[PDB]
């Protein structure tokens, strides 16, 4: 479940 700026 995520990690950046998307």
């Amino acid at each position, epitope marked *: *479940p*995520p*990690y*950046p*700026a*998307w």
Partner: antibody, heavy 120, light 110 residues
């Protein structure tokens, strides 16, 4: 028609580096992320990392953190992955795949991959 | 950290509904695993079909859909077509990296 072209094969020697190219076209290169996968028969697929054309900001699979280096060139619209201290364990097929994240979210388009054979 | 596992091989007939599944070993496959499904055809023909568990990639035939069946993610081909005979991979996101499954060889008797 969206496409990604990659060399079909590359022969390189153990202990050297290779720079695999993945030419993109058919869209705006900077609006989609580019991911690289490693395949060896019997071993399924292995996600190496991801890059974004704009920031150049990467997210590396921890196992390939110092083995691979993702990079891109805006004018030519091509993504690059450099493998560094090559050995027999790096012989595999390397694919680049596009992924959309703002208006959808998934892997969509894949190049045919470059079969890398590391031997002397 | 997670071995994703898919059915070895499945066989269906033209016109039927076939379901491919995907087991995660950390636990039940959720909506934050953003399960992705990928179709592989001869000559390294890799195509994305579903992303984020149930989001069909633009252009993908409607007979393909992704979902969740119990504690796993699943791919459902409604009215399986002779051209769907391909290998299907599963891809689960795990907080900062994807892990792929072995892949399921699908046969739609053509």
């Amino acid at each position: 028609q969206v496409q990604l072209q990659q060399p079909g094969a590359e022969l390189v020697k153990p202990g050297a580096s290779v720079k695999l190219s993945c030419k993109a076209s058919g869209y705006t290169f900077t609006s989609y992320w580019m991911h690289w996968v490693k395949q060896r028969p019997g071993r399924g697929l292995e996600w190496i990392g991801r890059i974004d054309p704009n920031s150049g900001g990467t997210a590396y699979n921890e196992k390939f953190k110092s083995k691979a280096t993702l990079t891109v060139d805006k004018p030519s619209s091509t993504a690059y992955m450099a493998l560094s201290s090559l050995t027999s364990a790096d012989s595999a097929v390397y694919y680049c795949a596009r992924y959309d994240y703002y208006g959808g979210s998934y892997f969509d388009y894949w190049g045919q991959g470059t079969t890398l054979t590391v031997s002397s | 950290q997670a071995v994703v596992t898919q059915e070895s091989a499945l066989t269906t007939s033209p016109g039927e509904t076939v379901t491919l599944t995907c087991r995660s070993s950390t636990g039940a496959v959720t909506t934050s695993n953003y399960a992705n499904w990928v179709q592989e055809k001869p000559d390294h023909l890799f195509t994305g079909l579903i992303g984020g568990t149930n989001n069909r990639a633009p252009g993908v035939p409607a007979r393909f859909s992704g979902s969740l069946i119990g504690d796993k993610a699943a791919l459902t081909i409604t009215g399986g077509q002779t051209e769907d005979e391909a290998i299907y991979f599963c891809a689960l996101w795990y907080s900062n990296h994807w892990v792929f499954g072995g892949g399921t060889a699908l046969t739609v008797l053509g």
